[PDB]
C-alpha cells in the first residue's frame, strides 16, 4: 500500500544525491587534477565503482512498487551480477587504500622502493579480477520464481543447507577481514604518530571511518542469519522493517566520497579552479 510508495520514494531520494556527489568528484578529478598524486588513482577507482553500484536501484525499487517483476527473466541476471561485482569491489578498494596509507606513514623511506606509479594500475586489475571471480556462483544460479496466484519475482536460490553456506560465505568476507585490517592499520598509525597538540584531529578521523561502516552493514547480516536460524512468520510490520535495511546497505555509497575527497585540502584548492 502506501508503505510501498514511501519505500519507492526513499529509494529514489538517495540515487540523485549519490549521482550528484559522484559526478562532481569525477568531473573535478578529471578536469584539472590530471592524476598528479598516487592517491588520485584510488579515488578515481573508488568513485567509478561507487557510481556503478549506485546505478542499479530503480530495478529493485520496481519490485516492491508493483510486486510482480515486469521486465522478465532476461535482465535480472545481469542486474544482480553487476550489483554483486560492485558491492565486492568497493570493500576491497577501501582495504587497499587503508593498507597503502599504513605502509606509507609507518615506513617513510623503505616503502618508496616497493611503491611505484606502475603498481597502482597493476593492483586495480587484480582487484577487479578477484571481484569478478567471487561473484560467479551468483551468476550461475540466477532464475525467476513464480506462483500461479499472480506472483512473480527473480530470486537467487535454487531447489536449506546451501542458504546457510551462502550466508557464511558472504559474511566471512564481509566483516571479518576488512574490519580487522582497517582497525590494525589505523591503531598502528595512531600509536606511531603519538610516539614521535593536533592528536585530537587524528582520533576524530578514526571516530568516523569505523563508525559508519559498523552502522550500515551490521543489521543486514544479522537478519539473514535469523532467516536461516528460525522459521519466521510474515508480517507487514516486519516487511516495513526489512525494507529499510536494504536501503541502509546502500546508504554507505553516498556518504563514502565526501569523507575521503571533500575534506582534502589539495582537492579543495583544485575544485575552485574548475
Amino acid at each position: 500500500l502506501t508503505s510501498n510508495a514511501v519505500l519507492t520514494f526513499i529509494y529514489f531520494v538517495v540515487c540523485i544525491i549519490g549521482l550528484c556527489g559522484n559526478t562532481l568528484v569525477i568531473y573535478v578529478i578529471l578536469r584539472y587534477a590530471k592524476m598528479k598524486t598516487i592517491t588520485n588513482i584510488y579515488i578515481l577507482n573508488l568513485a567509478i565503482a561507487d557510481e556503478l553500484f549506485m546505478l542499479g536501484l530503480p530495478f529493485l525499487a520496481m519490485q516492491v512498487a508493483l510486486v510482480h517483476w515486469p521486465f522478465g527473466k532476461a535482465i535480472c541476471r545481469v542486474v544482480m551480477t553487476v550489483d554483486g561485482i560492485n558491492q565486492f569491489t568497493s570493500i576491497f578498494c577501501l582495504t587497499v587504500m587503508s593498507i597503502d596509507r599504513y605502509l606509507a606513514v609507518v615506513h617513510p623511506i623503505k616503502s618508496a622502493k616497493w611503491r611505484r606509479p606502475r603498481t597502482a594500475k597493476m593492483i586495480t586489475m587484480a582487484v577487479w579480477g578477484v571481484s569478478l571471480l567471487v561473484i560467479l556462483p551468483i551468476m550461475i544460479y540466477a532464475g525467476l520464481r513464480s506462483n500461479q496466484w499472480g506472483r512473480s519475482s527473480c530470486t537467487i536460490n535454487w531447489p536449506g543447507a546451501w542458504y546457510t553456506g551462502f550466508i557464511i560465505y558472504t559474511f566471512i568476507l564481509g566483516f571479518l577481514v576488512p574490519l580487522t585490517i582497517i582497525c590494525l592499520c589505523y591503531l598502528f598509525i595512531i600509536i606511531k604518530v603519538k610516539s614521535s597538540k593536533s592528536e585530537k584531529k587524528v582520533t576524530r578521523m578514526v571516530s568516523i571511518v569505523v563508525a559508519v561502516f559498523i552502522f550500515c552493514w551490521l543489521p543486514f547480516y544479522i537478519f539473514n542469519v535469523s532467516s536461516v536460524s528460525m522459521a519466521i512468520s510474515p508480517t507487514p510490520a516486519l516487511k516495513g522493517m526489512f525494507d529499510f535495511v536494504v536501503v541502509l546497505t546502500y546508504a554507505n555509497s553516498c556518504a563514502n566520497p565526501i569523507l575521503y575527497a571533500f575534506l582534502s585540502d589539495n582537492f579543495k584548492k583544485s575544485f575552485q579552479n574548475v
Binding site: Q63, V64, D83, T155, I156, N157, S227
Partner: peptide
C-alpha cells in the same frame, strides 16, 4: 517458502 533472502522478497 517464507524467506527474506538476500536483497529481494519472494513469496512461495
Amino acid at each position: 517458502c517464507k524467506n527474506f533472502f538476500w536483497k529481494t522478497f519472494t513469496s512461495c
